[PDB]
Amino acid sequence: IVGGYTCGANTVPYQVSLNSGYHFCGGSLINSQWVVSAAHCYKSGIQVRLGEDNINVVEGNEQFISASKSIVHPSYNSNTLNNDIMLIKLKSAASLNSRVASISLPTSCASAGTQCLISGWGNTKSSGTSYPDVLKCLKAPILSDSSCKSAYPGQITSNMFCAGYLEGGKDSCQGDSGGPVVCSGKLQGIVSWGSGCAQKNKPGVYTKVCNYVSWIKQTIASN
Ligand SMILES: Nc1ccc(CNC(=O)[C@@H]2CCCN2C(=O)[C@H](N)Cc2ccccc2)cn1
Ligand SMILES: [Ca+2]
């Protein structure tokens, strides 16, 4: 997260870290058994880390649970990042508590200008590299479809939206991918892609979760 702030320990209790010997992506707990993340975060052998603040220090509220299965969206296209969404099942159910909590799926898509919370452990610099150990947060509005498509002509599908600031300076970044964009209590986005981070007229692009609720519900009900 570039241009954000320290969230506060366990203030984003649906945020998870995907770990394969090291943190590599975020995700969102959507019920005690299931995490949603980005398809481009897929790999085998994921350990889901819940209840995290400092990902380099055991602070006492963590749950470490291996994934039993990963399901990439059937239409995920890594060339275009269309349908950049993936479900991960936990080998054992998470123990839900004030610090480990699920986030609701949207019943409907959200308006341009709606304020959202974006979070993750990714790079905090728009030029160069600095990774935080504690969770970082950003408040950012959904941008108009036309602003989004003007920034990224020929690249934005109906399954993507932009959020952030066309002036740059505040954005998601490498290492935030797969993590949440939450607006009015609903998981509206997944950190997906952009042109660098916090660049002018290049806001972050997010998977439009409202288009995937039927697939999420059907997939978890059969797996
Ligand atoms: N707002 C944002 C969000 C994320 C980022 C950092 N990530 C990227 O710039 C691109 C797009 C997302 C994936 N990625 C990578 O470079 C991958 N390491 C390889 C890959 C490339 C393309 C498709 C799949 C995989 C920057 N700004
Ligand atoms: Ca920790």
DSSP string, the chain: -BS-EE--TTSSTTEEEEESSSEEEEEEEEETTEEEE-GGG--SS-EEEES-SSTTS--S--EEEEEEEEEE-TT-BTTTTBT--EEEEESS----BTTB---BPPSS---TT-EEEEEESS---SSS----SS-EEEEEEBPPHHHHHHHSTTT--TTEEEES-TT-S-B--TT-TT-EEEETTEEEEEEEE-SSSS-TT--EEEEEGGGGHHHHHHHHHT-
129 and 188 assigned to the same domain: yes
Give the tokens for residue 74.
Answer: 């059937």
Please name every residue paired with 123 in a beta bridge, in sequence order, or none if there are none: none
Choose among 86, 67, 84: nearest CA to 20: 67
CB 187 within 8 A of CB 105: yes
Q: 162 and 115 in one domain?
A: yes
- Site to probe by mutation for ligand 1, drawn from 193, 201, 207 as the one with most ligand atoms within 8 Å of Cβ, is 193
Contact 50/29 with Cβ under 8 angstroms? yes
Domain span including residue 59: 13-102+211-222
* 47 plus 152 within the same structural domain: no
Shared domain check, 91 and 19 = yes
Q: Are residues 45 and 150 in the same domain?
A: no
**Pairing outcome for strands 34-37 and 5-6:** unpaired
Which tokens belong to 127? 């030029």
Distance CA 147, CA 145 (A): 6
Residue whose Cα lies nearest atom 7 of ligand 1: it is: 174
17 alpha-carbon distance from chain centroid: 10
Pairing between β-strand 180-183 and β-strand 186-193 as defined by DSSP bridges: antiparallel
- Going from the Cα of 201 to the center of ligand 2, the distance in angstroms, rounded, reads 35
- Closest listed residue to residue 28, CA positions, set 12, 4, 11, 10: 12
Phi and psi of 193, rounded to 5°?
A: -165, 175
Measured in angstroms, the resolution is 1.6
| Number of domains into which the chain is organized | 2
Same domain, 114 and 77: no
How was this entry determined?
Answer: X-ray
Which ligand 1 atom is at minimum distance from the Cα of 203?
1
Task: Decide: 75 and 83 in contact? Cβ < 8 Å.
Answer: yes
- The CATH number assigned to the domain holding 56 equals 2.40.10.10
Collect residues with CB below 5 Å from ion ligand 2: 52, 54, 59
3-state secondary structure 41-90: HCCCCCEEEECCCCCCCCCCCCEEEEEEEEEECCCCECCCCECCCEEEEE
| Residue 87 in tokens | 């479900």
Lay out the sheet containing 204-208: strands in order across. 5-6, 136-141, 115-120, 180-183, 186-193, 204-208, 160-163
Whether 50 and 95 share a structural domain: yes
Assess whether 96 and 18 both reside in one domain.
yes
